[PDB]
Amino acid sequence: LSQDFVEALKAVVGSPHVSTASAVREQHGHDESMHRCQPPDAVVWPQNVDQVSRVASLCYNQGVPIIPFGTGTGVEGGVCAVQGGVCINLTHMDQITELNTEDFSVVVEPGVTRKALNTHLRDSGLWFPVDPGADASLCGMAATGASGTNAVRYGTMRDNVINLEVVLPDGRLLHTAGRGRHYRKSAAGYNLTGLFVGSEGTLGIITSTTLRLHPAPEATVAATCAFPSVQAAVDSTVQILQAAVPVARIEFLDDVMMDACNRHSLNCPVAPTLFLEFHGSQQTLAEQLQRTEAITQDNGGSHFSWAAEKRNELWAARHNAWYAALALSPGSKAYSTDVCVPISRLPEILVETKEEIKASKLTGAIVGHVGDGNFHCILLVDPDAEEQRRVKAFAENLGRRALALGGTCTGEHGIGLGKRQLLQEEVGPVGVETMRQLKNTLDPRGLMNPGKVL
Ligand SMILES: Cc1cc2nc3c(=O)[nH]c(=O)nc-3n(C[C@H](O)[C@H](O)[C@H](O)COP(=O)(O)OP(=O)(O)OC[C@H]3O[C@@H](n4cnc5c(N)ncnc54)[C@H](O)[C@@H]3O)c2cc1C
Ligand SMILES: CC(C)CC(=O)C(=O)O
Ligand SMILES: [Mn+2]
């Protein structure tokens, strides 16, 4: 970056909001993944959408790559500046607006996290359910297509994003469903909102998200259930889903993960475990609990260990599983897998994954959203090239096994830098070309987060 170009950026956002300092660039050059690249050439903090547009236009027309940056909690290298350029940190736009409690909807800017929104909504009787473990930007969650523990009942970001405000790569402003619009369903034209959910910053910059809100449950019960084997826990999960029990949360931890979480938080029996949560009235809960206990008992599950204080720490421990695993070997980093398969194939692939972790000399823990047919294998790495190549090979083989079972290589984390070859295998040549044609019409010069997804 030329001094002329830096001065032009400063003319848009203000001198304090542009930095070319190495330490600041390095802090914005990575996420929570093990990937690393040269850092961006500058970091810029726009203060409003007009500034986002003008920064994008300046970069685009000068041939400078743009890297959108929310809270930097992604795990696939989405913010890594593989071709340099300008990192646009969006978190100074942090306002909640257009709260429509009667319509179950709200508009948030990129600096708003789920915790901030739900704190704003205290006493409204409403909440936002999609819950990554990290304190992530809600617009970043829209960009990655995030889900979480509550998605089995309340949906993913794709289910709960009603509208998006997007600055396109050349600076034009798009409201994907129309400015100010919010509604339960539409057949009007092509659905542009779904195209930008899960686009990971490669099609434009999300500067606001319109979110579906949900009623707070009448009553809540959480519990844990320990099992003799991974097979028994995952068989119970599949049978709970096939019985159509509307569980609010159903999270699997293997024995390694449960021990890690105990040590980093809980004193649950070290065994493959389900964390469960149920929502309803006193009267629906009793029914759901009886039917779910009947199924878990059939598969060797323990009596439910029941859990505001204790369920809050139960789910905080789950949400920090990433850090619990890293803490097993301080100094390590980690890669996470994220496959999602048809639920009837989930027992095969989890049990196979457990066996393969046992047979390898990698250290790995298993956790995740099995109600969705989804799970994470957390593989620790010495930041040891041969161990790194074994971890990459393990993750590729697990991805390809998921694809062989009719599934997908990522249920929620995205593609970033790590899964680009798996995506090509997953959708094939016509799928790849079609995605690339979409990328090219919105980003002709290829400057919108280059090197990611495709
Ligand atoms: C402990 C922990 C637990 C997690 N649990 C989950 C989980 O349960 N489910 C899940 O889905 N993820 C989970 N994540 C991953 C991560 O939190 C999500 O992917 C989240 O959506 C990333 O948001 P972010 O703003 O931090 O992303 P960043 O890392 O800042 O960016 C991620 C990608 O999105 C792009 N991007 C970010 N903001 C925008 C924007 N406003 N407009 C356009 N593109 C943008 C970036 O360019 C990049 O490609 C977890 C992460 C951690 C560390
Ligand atoms: C921490 C992530 C790598 C795994 C995840 O998404 C989760 O904890 O559910
Ligand atoms: Mn997850």
UniProtKB/Swiss-Prot annotation:
Carries keyword Oxidoreductase? yes
One BP term from GO = ATP biosynthetic process
Against Pfam families, the record matches this protein to: FAD-oxidase_C, FAD_binding_4
Task: Give the location in the cell.
Answer: Mitochondrion
Keywords of the record, alphabetical order, are: Acetylation, FAD, Flavoprotein, Mitochondrion, Oxidoreductase, Transit peptide
User: Which cofactor does this sequence's record say it needs?
Assistant: FAD
Expression (tissue specificity)? Readily detected in liver and kidney, with a weaker signal observed in heart, skeletal muscle, stomach, brain, and lung.
Q: Which GO terms describe its molecular function?
A: D-lactate dehydrogenase (cytochrome) activity; D-lactate dehydrogenase activity; FAD binding
| The reaction(s) this protein catalyses | (R)-lactate + 2 Fe(III)-[cytochrome c] = 2 Fe(II)-[cytochrome c] + pyruvate + 2 H(+)
* GO terms for cellular component: mitochondrial inner membrane; mitochondrion
Query: Sites of the modification N6-acetyllysine?
Result: 10, 392, 419
The record ties this protein, via InterPro entries, to: FAD-bd_oxidored_4_C, FAD-bd_PCMH, FAD-bd_PCMH-like_sf, FAD-bd_PCMH_sub1, FAD-bd_PCMH_sub2, FAD-linked_Oxase-like_C, Oxid_FAD_bind_N, Vanillyl_alc_oxidase_C-sub2
Report the PANTHER family cross-referenced here: D-LACTATE DEHYDROGENASE, D-LACTATE DEHYDROGENASE, MITOCHONDRIAL-RELATED
Q: Which family does it belong to?
A: Belongs to the FAD-binding oxidoreductase/transferase type 4 family.
**Official protein name in the record:** Probable D-lactate dehydrogenase, mitochondrial
Species of provenance: Mus musculus (Mouse)
The lineage is: Eukaryota, Metazoa, Chordata, Craniata, Vertebrata
